[PDB]
Write a protein that holds these residues in place. Structure first.
Motif, PDB file in Angstrom:
ATOM      1  N   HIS A 172       2.360  -0.523   1.902  1.00 58.68           N
ATOM      2  CA  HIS A 172       1.939   0.230   3.076  1.00 58.68           C
ATOM      3  C   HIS A 172       0.774  -0.409   3.794  1.00 58.68           C
ATOM      4  CE1 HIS A 172       4.495   3.373   1.350  1.00 58.68           C
ATOM      5  NE2 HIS A 172       4.575   3.816   2.593  1.00 58.68           N
TER       6      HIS A 172
ATOM      7  N   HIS B  67       2.544  14.580   3.081  1.00 63.12           N
ATOM      8  CA  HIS B  67       3.909  14.461   3.580  1.00 63.12           C
ATOM      9  C   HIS B  67       4.583  15.833   3.517  1.00 63.12           C
ATOM     10  CE1 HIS B  67       4.616  10.148   4.224  1.00 63.12           C
ATOM     11  NE2 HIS B  67       3.933   9.886   3.120  1.00 63.12           N
TER      12      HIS B  67
ATOM     13  N   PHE C 200       2.435   9.556  10.607  1.00 68.61           N
ATOM     14  CA  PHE C 200       2.688   8.802   9.382  1.00 68.61           C
ATOM     15  C   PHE C 200       1.672   7.676   9.251  1.00 68.61           C
ATOM     16  CE2 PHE C 200       5.389   6.870   6.047  1.00 68.61           C
ATOM     17  CZ  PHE C 200       4.913   5.561   6.065  1.00 68.61           C
TER      18      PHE C 200
ATOM     19  N   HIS D  23      -1.275  11.862  -1.375  1.00 64.69           N
ATOM     20  CA  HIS D  23      -0.293  11.232  -0.468  1.00 64.69           C
ATOM     21  C   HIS D  23       1.013  11.998  -0.349  1.00 64.69           C
ATOM     22  CE1 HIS D  23       3.382   8.810   0.025  1.00 64.69           C
ATOM     23  NE2 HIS D  23       2.803   8.322   1.101  1.00 64.69           N
TER      24      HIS D  23
ATOM     25  N   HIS E 261      -1.857   9.018   8.591  1.00 67.29           N
ATOM     26  CA  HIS E 261      -1.907   9.457   7.200  1.00 67.29           C
ATOM     27  C   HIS E 261      -2.166   8.239   6.307  1.00 67.29           C
ATOM     28  CE1 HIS E 261       0.427  10.977   3.403  1.00 67.29           C
ATOM     29  NE2 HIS E 261      -0.882  11.025   3.245  1.00 67.29           N
ATOM     30  N   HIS E 262      -1.264   7.271   6.409  1.00 78.65           N
ATOM     31  CA  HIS E 262      -1.360   6.071   5.611  1.00 78.65           C
ATOM     32  C   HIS E 262      -2.583   5.212   5.871  1.00 78.65           C
ATOM     33  CE1 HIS E 262       1.821   5.934   2.697  1.00 78.65           C
ATOM     34  NE2 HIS E 262       2.458   6.771   3.500  1.00 78.65           N
TER      35      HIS E 262
HETATM   36 CU   LIG Z   1       3.966   8.092   2.969  1.00 75.85          CU
END
Ligand SMILES: [Cu+2]
Ligand SMILES: [Cl-]
Ligand SMILES: [Cl-]
Ligand SMILES: [Cl-]
Ligand SMILES: [Cl-]
Ligand SMILES: [Cl-]
Ligand SMILES: [Cl-]
Ligand SMILES: [Cu+2]
Ligand SMILES: [Cu+2]
Ligand SMILES: [Cu+2]
Ligand SMILES: [Zn+2]
Ligand SMILES: [Zn+2]
Ligand SMILES: [Zn+2]
Ligand SMILES: [Zn+2]
Ligand SMILES: [Zn+2]
Ligand SMILES: [Zn+2]
Ligand SMILES: [Zn+2]
Ligand SMILES: [Zn+2]
Lengths: 281, 285
Positions: free
Chosen positions: B66, B205, B224, B201, B227-228
């Protein structure tokens, strides 16, 4: 100057080494990346909702697979510098009485046809079930390679040499709308959509099993020998002749556009020699 | 170490309107879609086949995968607008809010709000509301507008807390064998959210719901990336705390999970992205 040879020209030891290297690629976990890449590209439409995808049904079909084989060949080379990608000249095996007798299906190579009693699982050869794991659409282990030689009613025979020469007569690489309906397009012709299934698509349907279908095709090592010939067929048209579309085609299909799932462009692979290899003929 | 990644709460109004504007351009050019596809492909790519681990999740390569993903995404942003970097959504502070649904991250001038129950849950507000932003299913085919179900599930009614983050930072090992969902005393598995989770994490989601709730479609929601960015930041912090603690497994792990193996669907390795600064960026704090 890496030389790609007709599978018929391949000394018993050259074939042994090719097979040997493919198993190592498999064992390391490298082979799976290729099955996955091809599956991903086939699901990547351009644009979304369309019938075209990154690797098929679009002008990118030819340069995408050329890049794919190049990368595959480089991995083989990193395992054994003397191994290059051979090509299966199906155009030629089509003349045989019985093509399944072709030296390409020998037990010391890609084995034979599927076994009807075992639901067409292949047991003869280096990739028989028990010796070679496969995966399904979903990325889950599938239980074994399968092959249906000319079992379909729409594809009972391999593409005849002629089918190859008429395609080579086409003057345009491709034509809009740059999809399956393109007319007078070398790309759509070679791919096999003009009066489908022909040429490319036709070999895929003739082999049957995983080769029969997009999401699982690569599971069969013959996929690479097939595509090698398709690539060679494209290189031949290029000795005489440029690519289309140049701009204004769907993103991912243009002359200079990244070919999923890579950043590679069609321009990047237009000349095979720039790529370090050349077909014996 | 030049590119600065900022808390979404530290952004000026213009900064936010440029970030959103660049995402739409990325989308319009067709480039955004290559990302959604990459993440979907990685999630289906098991290491090894038949296993529960995949290239991007349920294993050690979760964090470096990621990180590479955001780096590539950030580079495309910047090729569009050199002043735009990837901001991070510090959910652990939003968790403090009486009603997190009110955080400025969900403004109609940023991410947009919650889904509308009256409309299945389609988000009808913001720059990515249905009609303004195209979405894709697990098959690569078009689908109805982005969907969001804020804390609608029984398993994830709340966002993770500062206490949850702190505790995780406390783990001494990056990861432990078998290098999967069952790994114990592992920073990676705990930040990912599998230990007694859904947590951290995985919990964010699940809390967001909609496409963000499932692996094959989660990138359809621009949040997304925010978040990451926080998950990556949390990892960058952990790296600092345990300076004398490298990545694991170094070797003899599944191919694609080791320190120097290529990460699907790229050739890039965990080693390649261990130091964020080598990658050209740093976090606000
Ligand atoms: Cu994720
Ligand atoms: Cl030869
Ligand atoms: Cl499809
Ligand atoms: Cl020759
Ligand atoms: Cl700031
Ligand atoms: Cl489809
Ligand atoms: Cl700050
Ligand atoms: Cu294909
Ligand atoms: Cu093919
Ligand atoms: Cu994910
Ligand atoms: Zn020869
Ligand atoms: Zn599709
Ligand atoms: Zn011929
Ligand atoms: Zn004839
Ligand atoms: Zn040539
Ligand atoms: Zn799976
Ligand atoms: Zn740092
Ligand atoms: Zn700040």
């Amino acid at each position: 100057y890496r030389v790609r040879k007709n599978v018929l020209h391949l000394t018993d030891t050259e074939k042994r080494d090719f097979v040997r290297t493919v198993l190592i690629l498999k064992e390391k976990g490298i082979y799976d990346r290729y099955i996955a890449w091809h599956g991903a590209a086939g699901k990547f439409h351009t644009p979304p909702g369309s019938d075209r995808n990154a690797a098929h049904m679009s002008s990118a079909f030819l340069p995408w697979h050329r890049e794919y084989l190049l990368r595959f060949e480089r991995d083989l080379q990193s395992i054994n510098p003397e191994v290059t990608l051979p090509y299966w000249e199906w155009e030629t095996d089509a003349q045989m009485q019985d093509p399944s007798q072709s030296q390409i299906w020998s037990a010391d190579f890609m084995g034979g046809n599927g076994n009807p009693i075992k639901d067409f699982i292949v047991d003869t050869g280096p990739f028989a079930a028990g010796r070679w794991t496969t995966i399904d659409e979903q990325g889950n282990p599938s239980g074994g390679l399968k092959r249906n030689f000319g079992a379909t009613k729409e594809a009972p025979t391999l593409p005849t040499r002629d089918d190859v020469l008429n395609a080579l007569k086409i003057t345009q690489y491709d034509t809009p709308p740059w999809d399956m309906t393109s007319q007078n397009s070398f790309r759509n012709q070679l791919e096999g959509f003009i009066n489908g299934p022909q040429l490319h698509n036709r070999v895929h349907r003739w082999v049957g099993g995983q080769m029969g279908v997009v999401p699982t095709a690569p599971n069969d090592p013959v996929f690479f020998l097939h595509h090698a010939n398709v690539d060679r067929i494209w290189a031949v048209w290029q000795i005489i002749h440029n690519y289309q579309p140049m701009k204004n085609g769907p993103f991912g299909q243009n002359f200079r556009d990244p070919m999923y799932p890579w950043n590679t462009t069609p321009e990047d692979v237009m000349n095979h020699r720039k790529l370090g290899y050349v077909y014996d003929i």
